[PDB]
Amino acid sequence: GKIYGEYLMLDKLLDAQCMLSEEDKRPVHDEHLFIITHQAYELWFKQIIFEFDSIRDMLDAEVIDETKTLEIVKRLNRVVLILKLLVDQVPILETMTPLDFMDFRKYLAPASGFQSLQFRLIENKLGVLTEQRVRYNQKYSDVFSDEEARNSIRNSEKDPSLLELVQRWLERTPGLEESGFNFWAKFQESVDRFLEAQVQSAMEEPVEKAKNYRLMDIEKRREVYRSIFDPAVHDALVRRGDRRFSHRALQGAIMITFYRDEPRFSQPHQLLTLLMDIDSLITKWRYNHVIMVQRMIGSQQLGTGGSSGYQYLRSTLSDRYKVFLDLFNLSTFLIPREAIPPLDE
Amino acid sequence: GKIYGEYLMLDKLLDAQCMLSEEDKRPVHDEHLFIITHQAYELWFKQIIFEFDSIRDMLDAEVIDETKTLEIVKRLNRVVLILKLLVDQVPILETMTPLDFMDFRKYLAPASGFQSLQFRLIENKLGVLTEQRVRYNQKYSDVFSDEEARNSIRNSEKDPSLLELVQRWLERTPGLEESGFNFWAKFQESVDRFLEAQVQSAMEEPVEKAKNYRLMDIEKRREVYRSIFDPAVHDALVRRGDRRFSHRALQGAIMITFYRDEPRFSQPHQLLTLLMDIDSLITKWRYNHVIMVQRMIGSQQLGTGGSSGYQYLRSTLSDRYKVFLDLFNLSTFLIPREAIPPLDE
Amino acid sequence: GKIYGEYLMLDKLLDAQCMLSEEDKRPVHDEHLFIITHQAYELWFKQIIFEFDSIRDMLDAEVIDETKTLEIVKRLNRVVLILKLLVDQVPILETMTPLDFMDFRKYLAPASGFQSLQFRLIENKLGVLTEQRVRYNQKYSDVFSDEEARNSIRNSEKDPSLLELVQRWLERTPGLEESGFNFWAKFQESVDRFLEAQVQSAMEEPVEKAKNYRLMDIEKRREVYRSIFDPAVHDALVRRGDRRFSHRALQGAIMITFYRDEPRFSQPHQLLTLLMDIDSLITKWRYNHVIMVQRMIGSQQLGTGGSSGYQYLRSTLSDRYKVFLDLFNLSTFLIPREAIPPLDE
Amino acid sequence: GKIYGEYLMLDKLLDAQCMLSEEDKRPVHDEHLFIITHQAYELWFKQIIFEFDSIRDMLDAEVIDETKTLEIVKRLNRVVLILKLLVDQVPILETMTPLDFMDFRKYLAPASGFQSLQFRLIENKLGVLTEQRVRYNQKYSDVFSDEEARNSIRNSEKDPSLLELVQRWLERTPGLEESGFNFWAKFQESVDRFLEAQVQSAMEEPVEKAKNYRLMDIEKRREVYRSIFDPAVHDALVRRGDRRFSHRALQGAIMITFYRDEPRFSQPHQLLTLLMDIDSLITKWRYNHVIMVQRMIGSQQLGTGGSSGYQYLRSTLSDRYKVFLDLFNLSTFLIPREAIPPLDE
Ligand code: HEM
Ligand code: HEM
Ligand code: HEM
Ligand code: HEM
């Protein structure tokens, strides 16, 4: 259409609100808020999926130019803003009293009446690994009984996640080229030179206690650099789940963080930063959600079957559920400006 | 139902998104965001109306006890939070480029494709007076052509607004009773005594310039108190639109602000405070909205017919559109703690 | 004075900014931001302490009337707002690049150059128990070497915390009186009656699987109520650190949450709610802080001595550091409106 | 130093808080908050000035490369975040009751005790023109009596503002070169061609009413383009204060908004966007400030000398006080993607 309500299909949208306590002649005022809050979330979930899918398609290519990079940054930044908004929607629902919630929670399935298809789709499309999930809601068949739902989740798991496609993009970054700039080799070399210089400076320290601390610290630094310079050590950290990136992907990430001030790397950096922001904001939502759940129905209530639901949500707060874990730690491997191999080529 | 998607009618809700540039084989990515943003707004608009109507019904009674007062405070506070959220939704849409918006704005009616029924309902239910509106969108028939829409707006105008019902509630407040506490009389008396004391203190001022400033100020204070103590002056200020409250309503408001620290008046105060917050937040939304409009289509663009739409929105920012204008100014009439007639009875 | 800058002592305040990289002829622009950010925090920390101390003094009395209650609510609400602001200050500092921070971090003591006296004072004044802290920064002497600092922290530990004084206030709440309303006894009775009614309804269930789930659930409910109705079980939960309140304090808390809709209990409830908000916001700050630290210097960097600092901060995120832990769980013990003993007396 | 409190000069910073109602044996609790709130503002004001000055110095050069551009974007973005924070500090102070403020406002000079040197410095450094200010506080000598203050304000007025330096930068943008890309000429040409095409399409319209609206609209579009293509019309709009940019600066701005999707223009665009954000946020602060003032002391109170202070603040809300007014309107001159001259050279 052309008129507001026809274009936005408001006749459909605003007829999707059925208060179950109302049609059962025992009306609870706040049930209206409950419905609207979730529906607002669900609309935004759909937008997030829509942005995610379009970024997946753009990343599923051999060449990502500067122009498409900007478009991705924009869309990731948009998701960040939506996520902040979703974090702030929780205190609106927290405004309903526990006793009011109790008077209509009976109209809801114990665990099925609280699980969102779209949220699970967001997790998978972002890159939450199935094996990283806790035992409780690990298999999606146990969570969702519907058939069309199962097909979507299966598709989300099999299809390339945002985690996978970012890794492939990270592997192709210019500068890791042995033939060209050869950053990894130059990096190792400057780590050796910088650390050597550090040992000599520490040996010249007048106070004995200060010498020992610096020597101990330099040794702890060697162990850090061993975990990135020895591919065997890295692959081990991947297998136990302390890292997620392939070795070459981490190489790309580290290079980006190094030259982030440089016009050629500023946008790739921004992309990574927004990836972290998204991860962190999802965690922030999780935290707010669990505080609200506990505020409403404690750790356990009638019909809840004990405290396993609460304990599950509390365990989703762990780094096991963070998709871009490697990104948070990248400054661990950082050396000062002077020691970084200059960009010339 | 009992399962998430059945309860929230997600099959209806998530089938209300029709991108018109998509079905016309010229797809603009950001059109999806455009639709979702408005739909999120519309869902919240429905919640605001739902909260407003329930407050209207509660206020449409001769006796409002302490218990129902708390429930009203809660619901007004809920509306405040929703409004803050709606203010923060604007920068999400501002993330779409003007050039992208240009590629699908043709699918929208020039002024009809931007006017929301529910928003207009919120304005009227809150208490925006029709005569206070600017010439442009004053008559609702010119704005909305639909029949069911016209009936709702007509009903919103005729039915008691939040402004009306608050006034009636304000008129009944205990303490304005000549037989009882007789606040208005005690107030006048203490104004006289306080002002008298101020004149004498000013006459004793050593510096001549300081004496004159204080004497001029006391005269400006008399004029202030004349505008509330002389009903003729008040009624005149109502007629020209500088005030909205009846004389007795303003008397109630002023008393509440005076004893706001007192347990018996703290909730009535909170109610008034949230009324102001709501007004101010609607203004804050208006401001953000106009900045976004100008960011997208400037003051005027192709098909827009010049700059009358923009100038209209810019004029909605005036105090003519604020419903609880009297509330913002109440501290003008304030006298210090010592001069306020103590609560005894 | 009377003029802005004299009153606010701006000559002192704005002469407290000494960039150490500047006077050492190697200036880092962002060091100015680093200083200002902390100084803004420190000013707010002082305000929080000032509000806390005044609430401590008000609670350190046998009778807290309705009027003083409102004043406490106001001041706790003020602290909430300040805390939200402090949470939002982190992304401002996150705007400094790691490489820029590296160029001036040498001017700072490894662990001493990051520890705030006032923050530690806030923790203790709120009620963080010393034994609940992790091994790393448990004893304040190891943290702070200064003499005046040690005296303040010692005073904060020995003096009655906000946790202690709230408990005493909770113990005195009217309604726990055996002679009067006798809530605890009435509560036990209605738990028995409600649970009995639940067993009979479960026995009448047609489906066998549904009968068993409900019977298992009712058994899990008995265990919940045993932990509050048997003082021995409660005291055990206190000793291991799962609870903090005395038995009578928890009794008070539970009663408040039950009749929160009632004018006489709404403010006491609000007080408890703000206590939770404060706790949660401190946790939210902790989370943001740790994300920023990792963004700047990873899990470990040169001079840092390995990853013990990072791991410490990450462990401050546990419920061991939450002061009002009991408050978060109160809805666990909730029974529906009908089953709650009515207020008559 | 190396320890937290020595580095941050906390002994100086935390000794700058003198409550005047306290030393005069009539203590008002909230006076502490009043002081801290302003001091927090003042610290941030100093940071804003510090960021502004460093951007001024960077822009005061003939060549601004891609690298320095990024640094400017970063610092403008930092100012945006600080400004949002400052907007959110107002509701913290709004938490003090009017009656409490009344009990210590006597210790403050009527207009001098509310004027901030640093704020005035921010306004001038950003680019608020002296002639654009209202009569009330137009001359700084009338506002500030101190000598060192007068010298700083004089220096801020004479020295190149952020407005001036951005204009010069805008004038030099590559693409306005007649010898090179020649954007202005290509732009005029494509406006003619696009408008011609619009007339023909309008003439072919079946409905007569629709033909007339489109013809009227095209005429309104010609008037828009006349105001930018005829330098005489532009210069007139500058003189009356509807525009601020020189003709060539506006040419630069318009080109940037056109090719904002292009890697070469994305950062220059971002710079302009943040300039608008800063302007708008200052306006948002102004609005919040005036609402708070009215909440505390109404439109006028004892000692205030009538309502001129309030009316002044309310007039600072006009576009006369917006520095980058031209930037808000740039989409007015926009033509669709197809009609824009492609970047080749
Ligand atoms: C009265 C308010 C609410 C309560 C008591 C509540 C309770 C719960 C509980 C107990 C679970 C665990 C499900 C299970 O047993 O397996 C859960 C999961 C979830 N909830 Fe809520 N919830 C509330 C509001 C919301 C809102 C407003 C949203 C926004 C869409 C939401 C989104 C979710 C999502 C996405 C999950 C799955 C989480 C995961 O698997 O990590 N909830 N909720
Ligand atoms: C590309 C983004 C947008 C543009 C260009 C835009 C433009 C406009 C224009 C030009 C008007 C005046 C209508 C007239 O000519 O009479 C208007 C009114 C309105 N708009 Fe928007 N708008 C946008 C987004 C939104 C969003 C996201 C909402 C949220 C529901 C919204 C809500 C309204 C409302 C409620 C009115 C009526 C205002 C009143 O009468 O005071 N707009 N808009
Ligand atoms: C470049 C930015 C920052 C870094 C790298 C940083 C790093 C750290 C580290 C490593 C610790 C642990 C101290 C230890 O080793 O024992 C710490 C503690 C702390 N930091 Fe920061 N910090 C930063 C900014 C801030 C800011 C802006 C504040 C606000 C006042 C702040 C407040 C604290 C407080 C209060 C503690 C003690 C925490 C506790 O004991 O639980 N920090 N910081
Ligand atoms: C009880 C709270 C406050 C009241 C009643 C108040 C009142 C005023 C008044 C009446 C003016 C006009 C001055 C004149 O007469 O010429 C003013 C100006 C100003 N105030 Fe406040 N103020 C308050 C809090 C603040 C705070 C927290 C800040 C933050 C630094 C602030 C910053 C300013 C600034 C920067 C101006 C100059 C504005 C301009 O010239 O456009 N004020 N204030």
Coordinates of N, CA and C in Angstrom, one line a residue, chain B residues 97-100 102-103 110 194 198 213 216-217 220-221 224 258 260-261 273 276-277 280 283-284 287-288 291 294-306 314 319 322 328-329 331-337 340, chain D residues 97-100 102-103 110 194 198 213 216-217 220-221 224 258 260-261 273 276-277 280 283-284 287-288 291 294-306 314 319 322 328-329 331-337 340:
Chain B
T97 N 21.2 5.1 5.2 CA 21.6 6.3 4.4 C 20.5 6.9 3.7
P98 N 20.5 8.3 3.6 CA 19.5 9.0 2.8 C 19.3 8.4 1.4
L99 N 20.4 8.1 0.7 CA 20.3 7.5 -0.7 C 19.6 6.2 -0.7
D100 N 19.7 5.4 0.3 CA 19.0 4.1 0.4 C 17.5 4.4 0.6
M102 N 15.8 7.0 -0.3 CA 15.3 7.6 -1.6 C 14.9 6.5 -2.5
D103 N 15.6 5.4 -2.5 CA 15.3 4.3 -3.4 C 14.0 3.4 -3.1
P110 N 2.7 10.7 0.4 CA 3.5 11.9 0.9 C 3.3 12.3 2.4
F194 N 5.9 36.4 55.1 CA 7.3 36.2 54.5 C 7.7 37.4 53.7
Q198 N 10.7 40.2 54.3 CA 11.6 40.5 53.3 C 11.9 41.9 53.0
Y213 N 17.7 46.3 44.2 CA 17.5 45.0 43.6 C 16.5 44.1 44.4
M216 N 13.0 45.6 44.1 CA 12.5 45.2 42.7 C 12.1 43.8 42.7
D217 N 12.9 42.9 43.3 CA 12.6 41.5 43.3 C 11.4 41.1 44.1
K220 N 8.4 41.9 42.0 CA 8.3 40.8 41.0 C 7.7 39.5 41.6
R221 N 8.0 39.3 42.9 CA 7.4 38.2 43.7 C 5.9 38.4 43.9
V224 N 3.9 37.5 40.9 CA 3.9 36.0 40.8 C 2.7 35.5 41.7
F258 N 4.7 21.2 48.0 CA 5.1 21.8 49.3 C 5.4 20.7 50.3
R260 N 5.9 17.4 49.8 CA 6.4 16.2 49.1 C 7.2 15.2 49.9
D261 N 7.9 15.8 50.9 CA 8.7 15.0 51.9 C 7.8 14.2 52.8
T273 N 5.3 14.0 39.1 CA 6.6 13.9 38.6 C 6.7 13.1 37.3
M276 N 5.1 14.8 34.3 CA 6.1 15.7 33.7 C 7.1 14.9 32.9
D277 N 7.6 13.8 33.4 CA 8.6 12.9 32.7 C 8.0 12.5 31.4
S280 N 7.9 15.4 28.9 CA 9.2 15.8 28.5 C 9.8 14.8 27.6
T283 N 8.4 15.1 24.1 CA 9.1 16.2 23.5 C 10.4 15.8 23.0
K284 N 11.2 15.0 23.9 CA 12.5 14.5 23.5 C 12.4 13.5 22.3
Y287 N 11.8 15.9 19.2 CA 13.1 16.4 18.8 C 14.0 15.5 18.0
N288 N 14.2 14.2 18.5 CA 14.9 13.2 17.8 C 14.3 12.9 16.4
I291 N 15.1 15.6 13.8 CA 16.5 15.6 13.5 C 16.8 14.5 12.4
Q294 N 15.1 15.4 8.9 CA 16.0 16.3 8.2 C 17.3 15.6 7.7
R295 N 17.8 14.6 8.5 CA 19.0 13.9 8.1 C 18.7 13.1 6.8
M296 N 17.5 12.5 6.7 CA 17.0 11.7 5.6 C 16.6 12.5 4.3
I297 N 15.7 13.4 4.5 CA 15.1 14.1 3.4 C 15.2 15.6 3.5
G298 N 16.2 16.1 4.3 CA 16.4 17.5 4.5 C 15.1 18.2 5.0
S299 N 15.0 19.5 4.8 CA 13.8 20.3 5.1 C 12.7 20.1 4.0
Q300 N 13.2 19.7 2.8 CA 12.3 19.4 1.7 C 13.0 18.6 0.6
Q301 N 12.2 17.7 0.0 CA 12.7 16.9 -1.1 C 11.7 16.6 -2.2
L302 N 12.1 16.0 -3.2 CA 11.2 15.6 -4.3 C 9.9 14.9 -3.8
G303 N 8.8 15.3 -4.3 CA 7.5 14.8 -3.9 C 6.9 15.3 -2.6
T304 N 7.7 16.1 -1.9 CA 7.4 16.5 -0.5 C 6.5 17.8 -0.5
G305 N 6.6 18.5 -1.6 CA 5.7 19.7 -1.8 C 6.3 20.9 -1.0
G306 N 7.6 21.0 -0.9 CA 8.2 22.1 -0.1 C 8.4 21.7 1.3
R314 N 8.7 20.8 13.4 CA 9.5 21.8 14.2 C 8.6 22.6 15.1
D319 N 5.7 24.6 23.6 CA 4.9 24.4 24.8 C 3.4 24.2 24.6
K322 N 2.9 20.6 24.9 CA 3.1 20.0 26.3 C 1.7 20.0 27.0
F328 N 5.4 22.0 35.3 CA 6.8 22.4 35.1 C 7.2 23.7 35.8
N329 N 6.2 24.5 36.1 CA 6.4 25.9 36.6 C 6.1 26.0 38.2
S331 N 7.5 25.4 41.0 CA 8.5 25.9 41.9 C 8.6 27.4 42.0
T332 N 8.0 28.0 40.9 CA 7.9 29.5 40.9 C 7.2 30.1 42.1
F333 N 6.2 29.3 42.6 CA 5.4 29.8 43.7 C 5.9 29.3 45.1
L334 N 7.1 28.8 45.2 CA 7.6 28.1 46.4 C 8.2 29.1 47.4
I335 N 7.8 28.9 48.6 CA 8.4 29.6 49.8 C 9.3 28.6 50.6
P336 N 10.3 29.1 51.3 CA 11.2 28.2 52.1 C 10.5 27.4 53.2
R337 N 11.2 26.4 53.7 CA 10.6 25.5 54.7 C 10.0 26.2 55.9
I340 N 6.4 27.8 55.3 CA 5.3 26.9 55.0 C 4.5 26.5 56.2
Chain D
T97 N 15.7 18.0 46.1 CA 14.4 18.7 46.2 C 14.6 20.2 46.1
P98 N 13.6 20.9 45.5 CA 13.6 22.4 45.5 C 13.8 23.0 46.9
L99 N 13.1 22.6 47.9 CA 13.2 23.1 49.2 C 14.6 22.9 49.9
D100 N 15.3 21.8 49.5 CA 16.7 21.7 50.0 C 17.6 22.6 49.3
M102 N 16.8 25.5 48.1 CA 16.5 26.9 48.7 C 17.3 27.2 49.9
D103 N 17.5 26.2 50.7 CA 18.3 26.3 52.0 C 19.8 26.6 51.9
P110 N 23.8 35.7 42.2 CA 22.6 35.5 41.4 C 22.8 35.0 40.0
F194 N 18.0 15.7 -14.6 CA 17.1 15.0 -13.7 C 15.8 15.8 -13.6
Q198 N 12.0 14.9 -15.0 CA 10.9 14.9 -14.0 C 9.7 15.7 -14.6
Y213 N 0.5 18.9 -8.6 CA 1.3 18.7 -7.4 C 2.8 18.5 -7.8
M216 N 4.3 21.8 -9.3 CA 4.5 22.7 -8.1 C 5.8 22.3 -7.4
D217 N 5.9 20.9 -7.2 CA 7.0 20.4 -6.4 C 8.4 20.6 -7.2
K220 N 9.4 24.1 -6.7 CA 10.0 24.2 -5.3 C 11.4 23.6 -5.3
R221 N 11.7 22.6 -6.1 CA 13.0 22.0 -6.2 C 14.0 23.0 -6.9
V224 N 15.2 25.5 -4.5 CA 16.2 24.9 -3.6 C 17.6 24.9 -4.3
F258 N 27.3 12.9 -0.8 CA 26.9 12.3 -2.0 C 27.7 10.9 -2.2
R260 N 29.4 9.3 0.3 CA 29.7 8.7 1.6 C 29.9 7.2 1.7
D261 N 29.3 6.5 0.7 CA 29.5 5.0 0.6 C 30.9 4.7 0.1
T273 N 29.4 13.9 10.4 CA 28.4 13.3 11.2 C 28.6 13.6 12.7
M276 N 27.8 17.2 13.7 CA 26.4 17.3 14.0 C 26.0 16.7 15.3
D277 N 26.4 15.5 15.6 CA 26.2 14.8 16.9 C 26.6 15.7 18.1
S280 N 24.1 18.7 18.3 CA 22.8 18.2 18.8 C 22.8 17.8 20.2
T283 N 22.8 20.9 22.4 CA 21.4 21.3 22.4 C 20.6 20.4 23.4
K284 N 20.8 19.1 23.4 CA 20.2 18.2 24.3 C 20.5 18.5 25.8
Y287 N 18.6 21.7 26.8 CA 17.2 21.4 27.1 C 17.0 20.8 28.5
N288 N 17.9 19.7 28.8 CA 17.8 19.1 30.1 C 18.1 20.1 31.2
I291 N 15.1 22.4 31.9 CA 14.0 21.6 32.6 C 14.4 21.5 34.1
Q294 N 14.0 25.0 36.0 CA 12.6 25.3 36.2 C 12.1 24.4 37.3
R295 N 12.6 23.1 37.4 CA 12.1 22.2 38.4 C 12.6 22.7 39.8
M296 N 13.7 23.3 39.9 CA 14.3 23.8 41.1 C 13.8 25.1 41.6
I297 N 13.9 26.1 40.7 CA 13.6 27.5 41.0 C 12.5 28.1 40.1
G298 N 11.7 27.3 39.5 CA 10.7 27.7 38.5 C 11.2 28.6 37.4
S299 N 10.3 29.5 36.9 CA 10.8 30.5 35.9 C 11.4 31.7 36.6
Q300 N 11.0 31.9 37.9 CA 11.6 33.0 38.7 C 11.4 32.7 40.2
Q301 N 12.4 33.1 41.0 CA 12.3 33.0 42.4 C 12.9 34.1 43.2
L302 N 12.8 34.1 44.5 CA 13.4 35.2 45.3 C 14.9 35.3 45.0
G303 N 15.3 36.6 44.8 CA 16.7 36.9 44.5 C 17.0 36.9 43.1
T304 N 16.1 36.3 42.3 CA 16.4 36.0 40.9 C 16.2 37.2 39.9
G305 N 15.4 38.2 40.4 CA 15.1 39.4 39.7 C 14.1 39.2 38.5
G306 N 13.2 38.3 38.7 CA 12.2 38.0 37.6 C 12.7 36.9 36.8
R314 N 16.1 29.5 27.7 CA 15.1 29.0 26.8 C 15.4 29.5 25.4
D319 N 18.2 27.6 16.8 CA 19.2 27.3 15.8 C 20.3 28.4 15.7
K322 N 23.2 26.8 17.3 CA 23.8 25.6 16.7 C 24.9 26.1 15.8
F328 N 23.0 20.0 9.0 CA 21.7 19.4 9.3 C 20.8 19.4 8.0
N329 N 21.1 20.3 7.1 CA 20.2 20.5 6.0 C 20.6 19.9 4.7
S331 N 20.8 17.1 3.1 CA 20.0 16.2 2.3 C 18.9 16.8 1.5
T332 N 18.6 18.1 1.8 CA 17.7 18.9 1.0 C 18.1 19.0 -0.5
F333 N 19.4 19.0 -0.7 CA 20.0 19.1 -2.1 C 20.3 17.8 -2.8
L334 N 19.8 16.7 -2.2 CA 20.2 15.4 -2.6 C 19.4 14.9 -3.9
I335 N 20.1 14.3 -4.8 CA 19.5 13.6 -6.0 C 19.8 12.1 -5.9
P336 N 18.8 11.3 -6.4 CA 19.0 9.8 -6.3 C 20.3 9.3 -6.9
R337 N 20.6 8.0 -6.6 CA 21.9 7.4 -7.0 C 22.2 7.5 -8.5
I340 N 23.5 11.0 -9.8 CA 24.8 11.5 -9.3 C 25.9 11.1 -10.2

